[PDB]
């Protein structure tokens, strides 16, 4: 049996069809919907100047400064951006309507260019997951509510138990 066994031979359980029952194959949807669909907003301003690792990590998925700068490394990330502001399509020179990232190492010029998210900034990553966030510059808040109660009791009042 053992002496006389044969070099290269089959399995038993898996002799051709692998699947277990554990729910791991089991593919509910889309990857992109559960695992992937986690959304995070952060202030605009200092979003300028890292493009794909200070978004992801600190903005709304990750400890992954560490991490994140790994994946992006790893080169299995993409970069997306979508205000909607302008009607001018990708154009390939550097669009702001719709972003596409290679994921290669771009610190401040992919940041500002794309992360300008006036309303929004995505991130995907396909080494496990997608995290999509959206940012708005303090100071155009003032704008906007630039006559509301917001104004008024944060800088003018400064006396809130919340602090800024």
């Known amino acids: ?19 277990p029952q554990s729910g ?8 992109f919907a559960n695992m992937p669909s986690a959304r995070v907003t952060l202030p605009k301003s200092l979003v300028y100047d890292k493009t794909f690792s200070k978004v992801l990590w600190s903005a709304g998925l990750v400890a992954s400064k560490s991490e994140g700068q790994r994946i992006i490394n790893n080169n299995g990330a993409y970069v997306g951006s979508r205000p909607g502001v302008k009607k001018n399509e990708p154009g390939g020179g550097m669009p702001d309507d719709l972003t596409f990232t290679p994921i290669k190492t771009w610190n401040a010029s992919k940041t500002q260019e794309f992360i300008i998210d006036g309303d929004l900034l995505i991130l995907k990553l ?33 006396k809130e138990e919340p602090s800024p």
């Open 126 to 158: 396909g080494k496990w997951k997608m995290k999509l966030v959206s940012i708005v510059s303090d100071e155009k808040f003032k704008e906007l509510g630039l006559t509301a109660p917001g104004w008024d009791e944060v800088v003018g009042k400064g």
């Open 24 to 31: 791991n194959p089991h593919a509910p949807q889309t990857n």
């Open 1 to 19: 049996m053992p002496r006389t066994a044969s070099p290269g031979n089959p399995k038993s359980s898996l002799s051709g069809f692998v699947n």
